[PDB]
C-alpha cells in the first residue's frame, strides 16, 4: 500500500548513529586499530603512562598490543565463554644501581571486546554497560545556606581521584579550608606554598575587611618548611612529623599527578571559570624543592570578589547540564583498569625488595592476577554492567542509550533528593523529559535524546542551525549547555519561505525561558522536534495530543513488546521506525550493488559487482535473554536485483524494515457488558484463529553430572523403578529426543546419583525383602519439567569432560542443555498496550458471532472502554483511530511526524474519501439505507451529531467525519443506540503473560535456619504473608486463621507434619504448637548472653524444647 507523509519540516541532518555512544567510547579506549606510536594519551594508553615508570630499580613501559579473539562471537555465547582479546605489554627493566637492561613482553590476561551493535559477551550472556551521569570536576561556588551573605567554594576532582574541598568563611572572619571533613585556617596552607603577607595583601586586599581577616601573624612567624610541619600535625595526630613523611603525605594529596586527578573537563572548567591556565591536572606542583600554587590563590581570589559583589562573578547551578557530565563505557572500564594496574604495581615494588636484586626479568616480576580480577570484577559484577534487554530490537537499542545517576560513584537510593530528579531547563535537546522509570527511580535514570551526542569532555551536545540576519543556514553547530545559553534560539516550526524566516514574530528561547522576538534578533534555530525526545518517545504518533504521564508509559512499554510471528508496522508511524531497525543491526543489508544468487531458509548468497559471492548466514530461532525468539527471515527472491543498502532479511519484530512491535487491529471504542471494567480488554476469537498476537518463546534447561565422594552422577537412560511409558521420548543415552512434546512432570535428561548413608532404613529393608528386589545403589535424580512449563524439544547440547574443546568447572563430568520451545496464542490474562499508554489485560475472548460489527458484516477486533480516555488525557490514541479508519478503507498507511503532523482538517479530507468506498460500493451494489441506521440517525440528531434535514447518506457521512459509524450488536442484531468510534489502532502484546506468572503451592521447600517456606515461583515458594497482611487478619479479629498462617502453614514443624496427615486422613487439623522460628529467636538471644525464659501463671519456667537442650 501507499504511504502518505504529512509535515512541512525539512530536517537538515539525519539522526546520528544511535549506538555510537557505546561503539565510539570503547573503540577510543582500546585504540586496537591504531599503530602504537600514533596513539594519543587517553583510555588504556593513558592508564599505562600514568602508572609507569615504577621506582624502587626501575620498570618502564614501552607499548601494549591487543591480540585477536581466541573464539568468535557465536562460539563464545555457546560455550559460556567471555568474548575477549589477549593483552600483552612490552616492558624494559632498568637497574638504577647497575645499568642492566632486560626487556620482555609480558602477558597481562584478556580484555573483553565490544560487538558491532554496542554490547558485550560475558560468560555466554550478552551484557550492556550503562553510562553514568555525575558532577563534572572543576571549581564551583555555591551559596552557604547558613549565612545569607557568604559563599562556599568547593573544589571537586574526578571520583576516587582526590578529596572534596570546602572553603567556608567562618564567623571569626578568617577563610577556612575543609579537607576529609576536617577544618583548619586556610592561611596556614598558603604559607606552605611560599606565600608572604605582601602577596595576599597586594593581590586581594581590595576587599577591606575580608583580606585582613585571612591574615594571621603566628603563621607568618615561620619559613615555608616550618609551616608545612605545623599543618601536618593538624591532619594526622600521633604520626611523627618527619620532613620527608610530611612532604610525601601533602604531595600525594595535593600535587601528585597520580594520586590527585582533576578531569580533562576539570582543567577546562577551571581554566574557563577562574580565568587562569592550568599546567596540569593537579592543584599544585613540586618544583625546585618547594611547592608552587596553581588553583588555590585563583579560587580564593574568585570567592572574595564574589562576596564583595564584583561584576563577572556568579554562583553556579550544579544541576545545569554544562556542569554535569556523562561517564561512558570507555571511561568506566578505564577507571577499573587504572585500579587493577596500580594493584599489579604493589606486587612489582614488593618483589623488587625480596629475592635477589639482580636475577629478575620483567616476566617473573609481574603477576597479572590483580589486573585480571579488576577487569573481570567490573564486567561480571559492577552496577552499570547489566544483563542485556533484548526482548525486541528496540529493547537493546534503548538500553544502550540510558543514563543512570546511580552506581559506584553516584547517588544511592536512600541518599537522593529532589534537585537531581527534576527536569532541568538544559535537558532540552539532550536528555529526554519523558522516558524515565515510574516509582522510586524517577529522574535518576533517563534516556539520551535522539539528536544528542556526548563530546570528548563528556558533556552532552545538541544540534542547532545558525541564523544569520534573517536567513537560516544549513551549517549545524553542536552545542554544550554552557555555550547554548549565550544565543537566542528560535523554535523548529517557525514559518519559512525558502531559506528565509517568514514570520514577523518568532517563538524562541533565551536560557530556556520562552520569549517572543523579531526575526532580526534570531541567532539559532532548533533542528527538529525529534531532537527533544528519546528514541522511544519519538515512536509515539500524535504525541502533541498526549498528557506526559501517559506518554511515558507509551515509551517504556514499547521496550516490552514481544516479537510476534505475524508482526506488522503501525498504520500511523512517526517516520523513525525505519531508522531504528537499521541502527539496531537486527535485520540485514546488501554491502555493495549486486544480484541475489541464492535464497534459503538458512542462508542468502549475494553476487556483487566485485564478483565475490558473499554468503550471509541467517540467525534462525535463537533464544534471547528474555526468551523471545530472535529470528531473521529472507525478504528477497533468487535473481532479484539489489542496490547498496537494500534489505535482504527482516529481523525479529520488523516488517519490510519498519519496526513492528505489535499488530494493527480494528477497534471499537465502547463499553461492553462489564468485561471492559477498569481497563480490561475484550478481544475477538478471530485474532487467535488467524494467529495474531501469537509469539514464540524458548526456555533453557540445564543439568550437570558431577563426581561425588559417594561415586559419579551418571546421565543414563536407566532410571530405577520407572515404567517404559515414562521413558518413551528418551534416546539411547537418557536424553529426550529432538522433536518431542514434553509436558509438566516429563523427564528431560535422566540422571542417577549414589544414595547417602540413609542407605535404606530398616523400615525400607523389610519392605524391599518382601518384593525380592535389591535396594538399588543409585536413586532417580532425573531433570524433569517444572509446573506450568513445557513445549517441544527443539535442541540438545551435551558437553562431557574428555571431549575436544571442553573442560568444566572442577568436579563436573558433564553438562547437558535442553532447549524447549512453545508457540503462545493470546489468552485471557496476557497484557496488551498501545503507544499512548492505554494498557490492560485480556479479560474476555468472544466468538466472532458476539462481536459488534459494521453494517457490511465485518466484525471488530478489540473493544476498549471509553472510560479510560478522559481521566488519562491521552488523546493521541483517538486521533490515531480516526486516521486509522480512513486508512482501513483507502488501503493506506501514514507517516505523521511528532508536533509536525496530520492535523484535524487534513484527516477529515482523508476520512471523507474513505466513506465513498464504505458506502458508494453499497449504493451501486443495489442496497439502500437500513432501517436501523435510521433509528440511530434519529438518536444522533437529538445529540447534535448530524444536522436535521438531510438525506441519510448526508448524515452518515457527517458521522463518518467525526470518526463514528453505526454498529450492530451480534447478540441482538439491534443497533447500538448511538454511533460508535471505530478504526485501526496499533496494539502490542507485552512481555507479562499469565503462563509465566501463575503459581500455587500446597507444601514445599523450607529455609535452613527458619524452616519457613522459600520464596519465588522457581523455588516452588510460598507467598509472603507480611506485617501488613497480619494486620489485615488482626483487624478482622480472625485469630484462628491468623494462627494457622503463623504456625501450621509455615515453620511449626510438629504442627505442619501433623496437619497434612490429618487432611489426607479426613480428620480436622490439630491445634498448633510452638513455631520453630521463635526457638531460633530464643537461642540467638542466648548467643548474646541474654536469658529468655518462658513462664507459666505460677511464674515457673516452661520448657519449649521438651527436654532436648537440658542436661
Amino acid at each position: 500500500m501507499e504511504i502518505k507523509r504529512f509535515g512541512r519540516i525539512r530536517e537538515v541532518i539525519p539522526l546520528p548513529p544511535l549506538t555510537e555512544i557505546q561503539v565510539e567510547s570503547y573503540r577510543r579506549a582500546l585504540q586496537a586499530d591504531v599503530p602504537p606510536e600514533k596513539r594519543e594519551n587517553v583510555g588504556i594508553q593513558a592508564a599505562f603512562r600514568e602508572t609507569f615508570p615504577i621506582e624502587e630499580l626501575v620498570l618502564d613501559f614501552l607499548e601494549y598490543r591487543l591480540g585477536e579473539p581466541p573464539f568468535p562471537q557465536d562460539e563464545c555465547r555457546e560455550k559460556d565463554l567471555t568474548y575477549q582479546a589477549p593483552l600483552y605489554a612490552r616492558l624494559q627493566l632498568i637497574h638504577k644501581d647497575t645499568g642492566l637492561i632486560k626487556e620482555d613482553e609480558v602477558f597481562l590476561g584478556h580484555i573483553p571486546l565490544m560487538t558491532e551493535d554496542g554490547s558485550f559477551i560475558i560468560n555466554g550472556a550478552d551484557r550492556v554497560i550503562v553510562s553514568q551521569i555525575h558532577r563534572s570536576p572543576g571549581v564551583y561556588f555555591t551559596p552557604d545556606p547558613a549565612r545569607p551573605g557568604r559563599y562556599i567554594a568547593s573544589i571537586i576532582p574526578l571520583p576516587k581521584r582526590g578529596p572534596w574541598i570546602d572553603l567556608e568563611v567562618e564567623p571569626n572572619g578568617v577563610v577556612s579550608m575543609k579537607v576529609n571533613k576536617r577544618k583548619f585556617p586556610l592561611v596556614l596552607l598558603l604559607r606552605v606554598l611560599g606565600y608572604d603577607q605582601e602577596t595576599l595583601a597586594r593581590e586581594l586586599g581590595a576587599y577591606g575587611e575580608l583580606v585582613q581577616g585571612l591574615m594571621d601573624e603566628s603563621v607568618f612567624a615561620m619559613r615555608p618548611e616550618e609551616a608545612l610541619i605545623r599543618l601536618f600535625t593538624l591532619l594526622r595526630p600521633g604520626d611523627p612529623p618527619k620532613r620527608d613523611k610530611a612532604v610525601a603525605y601533602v604531595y600525594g594529596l595535593i600535587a601528585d599527578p597520580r594520586r590527585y586527578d582533576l578531569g580533562e573537563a576539570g582543567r577546562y572548567k577551571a581554566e574557563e571559570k577562574l580565568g587562569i591556565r592550568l599546567s596540569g591536572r593537579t592543584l599544585a606542583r613540586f618544583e625546585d624543592g618547594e611547592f608552587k600554587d596553581e588553583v588555590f590563590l585563583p579560587t580564593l581570589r574568585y570567592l572574595f570578589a564574589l562576596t564583595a559583589g564584583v561584576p563577572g562573578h556568579e554562583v553556579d547551578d550544579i544541576d545545569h547540564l554544562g556542569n554535569r557530565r556523562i561517564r561512558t563505557v570507555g571511561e568506566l572500564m578505564t577507571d577499573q583498569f587504572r585500579v587493577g594496574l596500580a594493584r599489579l604495581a604493589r606486587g612489582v615494588r614488593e618483589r623488587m625488595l625480596m629475592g635477589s636484586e639482580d636475577s629478575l626479568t620483567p616476566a617473573k616480576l609481574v603477576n597479572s592476577r590483580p589486573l585480571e580480577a579488576a577487569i573481570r570484577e567490573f564486567f561480571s559484577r559492577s552496577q552499570l554492567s547489566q544483563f542485556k534487554d533484548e526482548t525486541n530490537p528496540l529493547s537493546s537499542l534503548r538500553h544502550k542509550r540510558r543514563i543512570s545517576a546511580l552506581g559506584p560513584g553516584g547517588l544511592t537510593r536512600e541518599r537522593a533528593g529532589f534537585d537531581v530528579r527534576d527536569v532541568h531547563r538544559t535537558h532540552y535537546g539532550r536528555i529526554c523529559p519523558v522516558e524515565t522509570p515510574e516509582g522510586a527511580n524517577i529522574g535518576l535514570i533517563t534516556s539520551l535524546a535522539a539528536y544528542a551526542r556526548v563530546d570528548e569532555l563528556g558533556f552532552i551536545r545538541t544540534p542547532y542551525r545558525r541564523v544569520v540576519g534573517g536567513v537560516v543556514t544549513d551549517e549545524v553547530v553542536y552545542m554544550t549547555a554552557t555555550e547554548e545559553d549565550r544565543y537566542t534560539i528560535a523554535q523548529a516550526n517557525t514559518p519559512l519561505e525558502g531559506n528565509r524566516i517568514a514570520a514577523e514574530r518568532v517563538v524562541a528561547r533565551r536560557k530556556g525561558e520562552p520569549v517572543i522576538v523579531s526575526p532580526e534578533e534570531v541567532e539559532f534555530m532548533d533542528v527538529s522536534p525529534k531532537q527533544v525526545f528519546s528514541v522511544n518517545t519519538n515512536l509515539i504518533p500524535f504525541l502533541e495530543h498526549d498528557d506526559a504521564n501517559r506518554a511515558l508509559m507509551g515509551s517504556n512499554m514499547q521496550t516490552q513488546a514481544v516479537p510476534l510471528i505475524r508482526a506488522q508496522a503501525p498504520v500511523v508511524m512517526t517516520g523513525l521506525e525505519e531508522r531504528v531497525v537499521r541502527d539496531s543491526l537486527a535485520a540485514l543489508y546488501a554491502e555493495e550493488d549486486g544480484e541475489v544468487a541464492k535464497v534459503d531458509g538458512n542462508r542468502i548468497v549475494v553476487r556483487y559487482e566485485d564478483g565475490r559471492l558473499v554468503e550471509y548466514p541467517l540467525r534462525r530461532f535463537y533464544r534471547s535473554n528474555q526468551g523471545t525468539a530472535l529470528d531473521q527471515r529472507p525478504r528477497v527472491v533468487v535473481g532479484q536485483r539489489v542496490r547498496k543498502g537494500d534489505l535482504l532479511a527482516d529481523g525479529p519484530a520488523s516488517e519490510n524494515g519498519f519496526l513492528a512491535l505489535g499488530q494493527n487491529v480494528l477497534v471499537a471504542i465502547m463499553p461492553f457488558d462489564g468485561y471492559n471494567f477498569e481497563d480490561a480488554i475484550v478481544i475477538s476469537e478471530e485474532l487467535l484463529k488467524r494467529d495474531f498476537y501469537t509469539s514464540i518463546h524458548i526456555e533453557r534447561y540445564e543439568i550437570e553430572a558431577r563426581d561425588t565422594k559417594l561415586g559419579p552422577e551418571r546421565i543414563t537412560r536407566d532410571i530405577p523403578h520407572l515404567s517404559e511409558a515414562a521413558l518413551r521420548d528418551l534416546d539411547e543415552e537418557g536424553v529426550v529426543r529432538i522433536g518431542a512434546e514434553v509436558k509438566p512432570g516429563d523427564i528431560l535428561v535422566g540422571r542417577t546419583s549414589f544414595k547417602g548413608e540413609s542407605e535404606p532404613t530398616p523400615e525400607e529393608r523389610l519392605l524391599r525383602s518382601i518384593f525380592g528386589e535389591k535396594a538399588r545403589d543409585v536413586k532417580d535424580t532425573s531433570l524433569r519439567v517444572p509446573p506450568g512449563e513445557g513445549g517441544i524439544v527443539v535442541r540438545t547440547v551435551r558437553l562431557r569432560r574428555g571431549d575436544p574443546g571442553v573442560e568444566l568447572k572442577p568436579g563436573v563430568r558433564e553438562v547437558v542443555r535442553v532447549y524447549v520451545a512453545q508457540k503462545r496464542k493470546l489468552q485471557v490474562g496476557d497484557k496488551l498496550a498501545n503507544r499512548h499508554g492505554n494498557k490492560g489485560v485480556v479479560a474476555k475472548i468472544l466468538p466472532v458471532e458476539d462481536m459488534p460489527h459494521l453494517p457490511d458484516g465485518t466484525p471488530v477486533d478489540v473493544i476498549l472502554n471509553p472510560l479510560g480516555v478522559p481521566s488519562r488525557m491521552n488523546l493521541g490514541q483517538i486521533l490515531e483511530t480516526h486516521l486509522g479508519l480512513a486508512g482501513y478503507f483507502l488501503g493506506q498507511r501514514y507517516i505523521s511526524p511528532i508536533f509536525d503532523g496530520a492535523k484535524e482538517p487534513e484527516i477529515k479530507e482523508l476520512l471523507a474519501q474513505a466513506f465513498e468506498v464504505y458506502f458508494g460500493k453499497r449504493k451501486g451494489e443495489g442496497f439502500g439505507v437500513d432501517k436501523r441506521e435510521v433509528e440511530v440517525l434519529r438518536r444522533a440528531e437529538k445529540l447534535g451529531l448530524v444536522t436535521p434535514g438531510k438525506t441519510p447518506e448526508e448524515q452518515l457521512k457527517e458521522l463518518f467525519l467525526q470518526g463514528k459509524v453505526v454498529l450492530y450488536d451480534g447478540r441482538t442484531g439491534e443497533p447500538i443506540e448511538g454511533p460508535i468510534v471505530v478504526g485501526q489502532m496499533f496494539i502490542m502484546k507485552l512481555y507479562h503473560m499469565v503462563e509465566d506468572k501463575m503459581h500455587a503451592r500446597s507444601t514445599g521447600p523450607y529455609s535452613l535456619i527458619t524452616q519457613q517456606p522459600l520464596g519465588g515461583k522457581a523455588q516452588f515458594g510460598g507467598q509472603r504473608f507480611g506485617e501488613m497482611e497480619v494486620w489485615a487478619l488482626e483487624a478482622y479479629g480472625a485469630a484462628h486463621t491468623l494462627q494457622e498462617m503463623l504456625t501450621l502453614k509455615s515453620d511449626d514443624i510438629e504442627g505442619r507434619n501433623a496437619a497434612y496427615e490429618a487432611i489426607i486422613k479426613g480428620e480436622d487439623v490439630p491445634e498448633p504448637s510452638v513455631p520453630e522460628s521463635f526457638r531460633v529467636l530464643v537461642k540467638e538471644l542466648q548467643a548474646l548472653a541474654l536469658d529468655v525464659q518462658t513462664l507459666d501463671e505460677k511464674d515457673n519456667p516452661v520448657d519449649i524444647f521438651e527436654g532436648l537442650a537440658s542436661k
Partner: protein
C-alpha cells in the same frame, strides 16, 4: 536541679539491678556462649 537529675538516672540503673536480682559484673563476659550449629550452617549446595 542538675544534682537531683543525675542521681535519678544513676538511681534507676541501681534500682533496675536491685529489683531484678542481676549482678552488675554479669555485663562483663567470662564464658562467651556459642549458638547451636544448625543455626549457623555449613551446607553443601547443589554444585558440591
Amino acid at each position: 536541679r542538675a544534682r537531683r537529675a543525675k542521681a535519678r538516672k544513676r538511681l534507676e540503673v541501681v534500682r533496675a539491678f536491685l529489683d531484678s536480682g542481676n549482678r552488675p559484673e554479669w555485663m562483663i563476659l567470662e564464658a562467651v556462649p556459642v549458638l547451636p550449629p544448625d543455626l549457623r550452617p555449613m551446607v553443601q549446595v547443589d554444585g558440591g
